[PDB]
Design a protein around this ligand. Structure first.
Ligand SMILES: Nc1ncnc2c1ncn2[C@@H]1O[C@H](COP(=O)(O)OP(=O)(O)OP(=O)(O)O)[C@@H](O)[C@H]1O
Ligand SMILES: [K+]
Length: 991
């Protein structure tokens, strides 16, 4: 469509031929599925191989390998000599690094682009559509939405597509369009046409723009634009290009890469310097003037020896596969940096309802007025059985069954519960259970109405489906809900305006109210006794609150609601419904009717999870909107407070906290474990205090008003069943809403980072050894032990596999017995630095000695001397000192094979060392991580197949050595296990 905002609801519906009540059909969606494509934005993969090679700016070093060979081909034509077979073999070494560097960039990075998407794949963008599959609403993927679909939306929902509104269910619908327009205030919507065709998005008030979200209200509409056709889509410019802050770990790694890259010069400076064009030198020396390649090949070998080329691939694979493991544990990670932060968590601020509790609610208690004896009063108290959402149970008074219809107060009680309610029961025929639609708290009220049956409706002979709403339906037939004043967290109550269907001759409209007992009862000027109405006296008000306090603070820890009605409400025309802040003014002069209290038991594993946090040095703070008596009692039942613990300074209502002096407010955020009857402003305020203590805080939230605190906290954690707005503002989502999942995610974050410390200290260690190996060769003068072609293959394959498997090491048994990790924790400590040198110098010497062992001493090697080797460059037929000796053997695949096979076996040994940080292998056998053992074999087999498959050993300049020569490799390799084990023992039983 063109002008959808200008067209009428009937006109836009017509343009797609769709019914508002049944939506599109099965084939009609198929028809539009081919025309419009999905609702997805075509992020360009580009599959750009040709231009990825053009980008590839990562390795500066090996790019400098490109420059000396490329322009120098001027020499290839003018080359002085007849050499043919030995001519073009060497240039393959220089060029192959270039071709392979394309693979280093491409294969590793595209897998990272897939990682970011893999996080979204576990919880796909949803949207509520109406189609001919079901008469009720249907929840499908947002991408499966096509223009013409009927979409339903409510507070917290992300608008899945550009939508022309059709009907608004609440009194008002407000949308936060801040992502699309610059408007920071929610905009009010309607269903009328906007006749101006050139109107701006700010003025197209009958439209819902994709990417925006609903601040308040509920409504329906028809989709107009999807994909690129979306108002936001066409633009796709306001975006930055993946603008993110380096993690404290990647920074340390980037920093360690930038400091040492300058240290490359320290060794490189020492080499080039030499020429030092001799300012007093003879005229004729037989100088070898073609020597402008010696310092060049070494600098390239240094770079390949100093850079952990395999590190980013191992990191990306570790996080991604770790995240999936977390997602399996119902912790869905939206941001990869959060996994590092997660391990540092020092405070968890957890919501109570549904997170610490099970959110399976049932009303087991209720009361109404009985008699008013002057200033005192008696109550009719009742119990109610059945704890599920099944509409089956009995109502008792003094354990005797009762007819609820007899009590006029119970008839009103049930009426308020039926009417001031947005929820329903639904019988799941497949699972054979009753399920809730909407809030648990409200559905409990729904389920209560069925059990009360206050009009004595015949229920025998109704299906399971009919029994779900039957008594609720009866009350709705008598009393019509015209509009509702929605629940708000500031007044903590809700009201609905209702009128009888039968013309009454008298006003007879009412407002039925339910809410937190403290506030609602404060706004009651009268009490209902049966059908009579008498003024509320403080003696009566004290009685009501005492019982309510007793229900909430008992062992059942009842979530309580007070119920009341306004007998003389204002007319709809006299109320301003655009703002919830006005609603408390309209809910006053109320008549108190009764209270209910409902089970919401603690989760079973939460107590242990709270103990685990204590062991791990993680403070736990309960945060709730519920009553302080209820909150504290749960805190005792799950162990946040002791059974007998004095909580007078450890627990606060939002108001109490607000009334504290700043000094006392600071103490509260230091010592308090329970904040009750809070408003969304308190979470942010709490986070601000926690940050001033340098705490790293995990905060939970589900609602639109939780977004600021979720963003402000170091780890925002959104409920899986909560709003989309909250999820977008958070670093993690609890798929099951469970507090325990927070703790399990923290444990995983602690474990994943520990494994990363290993394969970082492991891959860097191999580089540290490779550097002193090249240094040993330059300083001791010896021939080339290892070539950059071997280092690259080792750092990508030989070291590549065990590093990844290192990411899968089992966590320490005490991993949750240690305090939170400081985010400023050094990646390598003083003693750990000694571990670098002790290992680095080992494999450095172990590879040079191995290459010089086959040379100087062996049965089957030529047996030169030290001076013959140190000066190998002087091996010429004219040098008096090189006399009766051959120069051909100085370049041989055998000594390099000894050095490489030693380097390989060393790393396979060092990998097993890296199974744990300080734990000896005797108690941490290599099979503790099976993937690690299988990693050694797959790489070693990759090292055998690099010899006995003819094309491989030729380009690698290696030859398979003898069985006798292979044993010498083990003689110098295995002892690295002994040295490292000694270095483990020393810290353990000494440091
Ligand atoms: N649908 C509702 N209608 C009326 N009153 C409600 C409704 N839902 C909750 N309330 C009440 O007012 C209080 C405010 O609820 P709020 O959402 O802020 O916290 P909570 O519902 O107790 O959950 P949490 O433990 O996550 O804070 C509740 O404790 C309850 O007494
Ligand atoms: K945050």
């Amino acid at each position: 469509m063109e002008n959808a905002h200008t067209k009428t609801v009937e006109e836009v519906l017509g343009h797609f031929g769709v019914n508002e009540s049944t939506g599109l059909s099965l084939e009609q969606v198929k028809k539009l599925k081919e025309r419009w494509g999905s609702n997805e934005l075509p992020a360009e993969e580009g599959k750009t191989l040709l231009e990825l090679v053009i980008e590839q700016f990562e390795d500066l070093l090996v790019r400098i390998l490109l420059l000396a060979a490329c322009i120098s081909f001027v020499l290839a034509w003018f080359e002085e000599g007849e050499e043919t077979i030995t001519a073009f073999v060497e240039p393959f070494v220089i060029l192959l690094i270039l071709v392979a560097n394309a693979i280093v960039g491409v294969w590793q990075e595209r897998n990272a682009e897939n990682a970011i998407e893999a996080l979204k794949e576990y919880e796909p963008e949803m949207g509520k559509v109406y189609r001919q599959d079901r008469k009720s609403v249907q929840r499908i993927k947002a991408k499966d939405i096509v223009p013409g679909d009927i979409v339903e939306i409510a507070v917290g929902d992300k608008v899945p597509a550009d939508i022309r509104l059709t009907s608004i269910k609440s009194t008002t619908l407000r949308v936060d369009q801040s992502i699309l327009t610059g408007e920071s205030v929610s905009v009010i919507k309607h269903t009328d046409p906007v006749p101006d065709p050139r109107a701006v998005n700010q003025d197209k008030k009958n439209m819902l723009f994709s990417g925006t979200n609903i601040a308040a209200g509920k409504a329906m509409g028809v989709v107009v634009a999807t994909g690129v056709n979306t108002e936001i889509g066409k633009i796709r410019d306001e975006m930055v290009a993946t603008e993110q802050e380096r993690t404290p770990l990647q920074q340390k790694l980037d920093e360690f890469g930038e400091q040492l890259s300058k240290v490359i010069s320290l060794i490189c400076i020492a080499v080039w310097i030499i020429n030092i064009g001799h300012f007093n030198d003879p005229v004729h020396g037989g100088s070898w003037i073609r020597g402008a390649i010696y310092y060049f090949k070494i600098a390239v070998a240094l770079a390949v020896a100093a850079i952990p080329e395999g590190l980013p691939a191992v990191i990306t694979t570790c996080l991604a596969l770790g995240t999936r493991r977390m997602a399996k544990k119902n912790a869905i990670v939206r941001s990869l940096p959060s996994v590092e932060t997660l391990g540092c968590t020092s405070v968890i601020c957890s919501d109570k309802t549904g997170t610490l509790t099970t959110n399976q609610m049932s009303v087991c208690r209720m009361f109404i007025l009985d008699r008013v004896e002057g200033d005192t009063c008696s109550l009719n108290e009742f119990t109610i059985t059945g704890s599920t959402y099944a509409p089956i149970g009995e109502v008792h008074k003094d354990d005797k069954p009762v007819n609820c219809h007899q009590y006029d107060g119970l008839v009103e009680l049930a009426t308020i519960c039926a009417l001031c309610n947005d929820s329903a029961l639904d019988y799941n025929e497949a699972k054979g259970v009753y399920e809730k639609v909407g809030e648990a708290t409200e559905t409990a009220l729904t389920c209560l109405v069925e059990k009360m049956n206050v009009f004595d409706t015949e229920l025998k002979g109704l299906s399971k489906i009919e029994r779900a709403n039957a008594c609720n339906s009866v009350i709705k037939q008598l009393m019509k809900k015209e509009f509702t004043l929605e629940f708000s967290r500031d007044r903590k109550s809700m009201s609905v305006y209702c009128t009888p269907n039968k013309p009454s001759r008298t006003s007879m409209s009412k407002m039925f109210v339910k809410g937190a007992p403290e506030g609602v009862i404060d706004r009651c000027t009268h009490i209902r006794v049966g059908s009579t109405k008498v003024p509320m006296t403080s003696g009566v008000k004290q009685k009501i609150m005492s019982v309510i306090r007793e229900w909430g603070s008992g062992s059942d820890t009842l979530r309580c609601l007070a119920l009341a009605t306004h007998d003389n409400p204002l007319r709809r025309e006299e109320m301003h419904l655009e703002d919830s802040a006005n609603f408390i003014k309209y809910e006053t002069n109320l008549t108190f009717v009764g209270c209910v209290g409902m089970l919401d038991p603690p989760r079973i594993e939460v107590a242990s999870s709270v103990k685990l946090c204590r062991q791990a040095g993680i403070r736990v703070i309960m945060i709730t909107g519920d009553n302080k008596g209820t909150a504290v009692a749960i805190c005792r039942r799950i162990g946040i407070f002791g059974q007998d613990e004095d909580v007078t300074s450890k627990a606060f209502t939002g108001r109490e906290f607000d009334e504290l002096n700043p000094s006392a407010q600071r103490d509260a955020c230091l010592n308090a474990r329970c904040f009750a009857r809070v408003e969304p402003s308190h979470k942010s305020k709490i986070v601000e205090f926690l940050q001033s203590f340098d705490e790293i805080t995990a905060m939970t939230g589900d609602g639109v008003n939780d977004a600021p605190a979720l963003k402000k906290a170091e780890i925002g954690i959104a409920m899986g069943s909560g709003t989309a707005v909250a999820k977008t503002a958070s670093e993690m989502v609890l798929a099951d809403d469970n507090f325990s999942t927070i703790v399990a995610a923290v444990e995983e974050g602690r474990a994943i980072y520990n494994n990363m410390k290993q394969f970082i200290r492991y891959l860097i260690s191999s580089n540290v050894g490779e550097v002193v190996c090249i240094f040993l060769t330059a300083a001791l003068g010896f021939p080339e032990a290892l070539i950059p072609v071997q280092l690259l293959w080792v750092n990508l394959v030989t070291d590549g596999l065990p590093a990844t498997a290192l990411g899968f090491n089992p966590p320490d048994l005490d991993i949750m017995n240690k305090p939170p990790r400081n985010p400023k924790e050094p990646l390598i400590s003083g003693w750990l630095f000694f571990r670098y040198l002790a290992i680095g110098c080992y494999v450095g010497a172990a590879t040079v000695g191995a290459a010089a062992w086959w040379f100087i001493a062996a049965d089957g090697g030529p047996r030169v001397s030290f001076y013959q080797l140190s000066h190998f460059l002087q091996c010429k037929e004219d040098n008096p000192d090189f006399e009766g000796v051959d120069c051909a053997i100085f370049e041989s695949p055998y000594p390099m094979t000894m050095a490489l096979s030693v380097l390989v076996t060393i790393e396979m040994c060092n990998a097993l060392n890296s199974l744990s940080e300080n734990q000896s292998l005797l108690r941490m056998p290599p099979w503790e991580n099976i993937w690690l053992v299988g990693s050694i074999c797959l790489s070693m087999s990759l090292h055998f197949l690099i010899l006995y498959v003819e094309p491989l050993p030729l380009i690698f300049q290696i030859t398979p050595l003898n069985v006798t020569q292979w044993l010498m490799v083990l003689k110098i390799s295995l002892p690295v296990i002994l040295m490292d084990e000694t270095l483990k023992f020393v810290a353990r039983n000494y440091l």
